[PDB]
């Protein structure tokens, strides 16, 4: 009943488990809240989805972190700009491009899954739902497999850099992997320009916009964009979502004997894990915004959890259900912006979500204490997830390699 006394940029907001009920107060009290400091947030599903629908007020330009400036990328662009760069990558990510991966995919899942089968035991985070969308948007990019833990704790750095309580060590630890990063991109160039290949990064490499060669900085900046996206996001609703399963067994158990009701868990877990906890808007324009006056030039964070737990849309989102239909979340966003990758994002969970209800249907929870979750305010979900099953055989190896 109190109001809430936070700061929507400190991580350990977003990992200490408050945030929920932080959420209620604010979506019943004051929807469009703002913070300790000051910044405005939209905590209502309407108050999200109002500004998702008028871009010309609700700006993307002003870049979409609270503590940052606009960025050389697409999702910190507005129409027509931003469209220009939609088209530079939209082909990779056409529904039949997407589900001619299925056989590619599942491979990879196959493989993750064998590695661990005959142990009877493995961290669902690390061993599962990192690796996978890390491999397929990697082999997308062109990312030679030894590579991929390399760009991936990259990302992990970046990502973990995102909190107004994290130490001088962890911002130097962000800036060096981001120069890092744009050796590793620079030296793509190089080999792209000379020998282009059919993958994600070649293509953005020789890339056109308004004329001229896509520059050095919004190569980076674009790779890093659709690498980011790729594997610091699926991850999180692959081991939440796996959680929420694993808690609520009479629905663990219909989707063992049902795989029919995959597509709808799916949806349920994405709205229940949220991997991407807000994304910025600059106001164009002084307006007043649901109860709150916002002023031109000011950020408001679009809070697409507490939106996802909006009682007056959902009914009653505080229930996980696997049964919840319509669905209608927002995880993946609305609008110009609606995720590139949802598709992907959406075959990866359905292809190794099936694989794990198939091939380890006793799953449990190593001990039902507490699953940590990572104190960053951008993206977010589990930390590590200890997970225990009867060992099993393994399906690629052993039956011919
Ligand atoms: C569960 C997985 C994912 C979640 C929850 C998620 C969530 C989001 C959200 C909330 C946005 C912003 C939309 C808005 O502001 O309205 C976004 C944009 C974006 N995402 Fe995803 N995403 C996921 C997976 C992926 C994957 C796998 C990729 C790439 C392979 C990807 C690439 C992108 C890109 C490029 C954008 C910018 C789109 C634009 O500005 O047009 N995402 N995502
Ligand atoms: C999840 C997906 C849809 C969005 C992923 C967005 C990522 C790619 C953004 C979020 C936060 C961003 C960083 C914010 C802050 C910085 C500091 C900046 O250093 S500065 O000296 O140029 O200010 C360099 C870019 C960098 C590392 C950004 C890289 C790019 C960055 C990781």
């Avoid at 004997?257 to 106001?283: F, H, Q, Y």
């Amino acid at each position: 009943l109190t109001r809430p006394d936070v700061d929507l940029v400190n991580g350990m907001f977003y990992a200490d488990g408050g945030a929920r009920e932080a959420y209620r107060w604010m979506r019943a009290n004051e929807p469009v809240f703002r913070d300790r400091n000051g910044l405005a947030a939209a905590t209502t599903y309407q108050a999200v989805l109002d500004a998702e629908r008028n871009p010309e007020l609700f700006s993307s330009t002003g870049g979409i972190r609270p503590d940052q400036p606009g960025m050389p990328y697409m999702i910190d662009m507005d129409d027509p700009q931003h469209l220009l760069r939609r088209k530079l990558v939209n082909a990779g990510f056409t529904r039949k491009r997407v589900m001619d991966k299925v056989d590619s995919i599942g491979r990879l899942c196959d493989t993750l899954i064998d590695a661990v089968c005959e142990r009877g035991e493995c961290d669902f985070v690390r061993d599962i739902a990192a690796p996978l969308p890390m491999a397929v948007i990697g082999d997308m990019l062109g990312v030679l497999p030894t590579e991929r833990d390399m760009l991936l704790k990259w990302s992990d750095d970046l990502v973990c850099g995102l909190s107004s309580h994290v130490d001088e060590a962890a911002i130097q630890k962000l800036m060096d992997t981001f120069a890092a990063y744009t050796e590793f991109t620079k030296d793509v160039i190089t080999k792209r320009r000379a020998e282009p290949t059919d993958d994600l990064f070649s293509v953005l490499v020789n890339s056109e916009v308004e004329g001229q060669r896509m520059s050095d900085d919004e190569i980076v900046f674009e790779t890093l964009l659709i690498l980011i996206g790729g594997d610091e996001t699926t991850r999180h609703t692959l081991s939440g979502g796996t959680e929420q399963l694993l808690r609520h067994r009479d629905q663990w158990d219909a989707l063992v004997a049902d795989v029919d009701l995959l597509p709808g868990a799916i949806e349920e877990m994405l709205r229940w894990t949220s991997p991407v906890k807000n994304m910025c808007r600059t106001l164009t324009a002084d307006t007043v915004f649901h109860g709150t006056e916002l002023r031109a030039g000011e950020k408001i964070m679009l809070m697409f959890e507490s939106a996802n737990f909006d009682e007056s849309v959902f009914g009653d989102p505080d229930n996980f259900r696997i049964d919840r239909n319509p669905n209608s979340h927002v995880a993946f966003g609305f609008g110009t912006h609606f995720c590139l990758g949802n598709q992907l994002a959406r075959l990866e969970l359905r292809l190794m979500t099936e694989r794990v209800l198939r091939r380890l249907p006793d799953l449990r929870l190593a001990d039902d204490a507490p699953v940590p979750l990572r104190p960053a305010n951008f993206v977010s979900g589990p930390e590590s997830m200890p997970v225990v099953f009867t060992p099993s055989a393994p399906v690629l190896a052993h039956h011919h390699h």
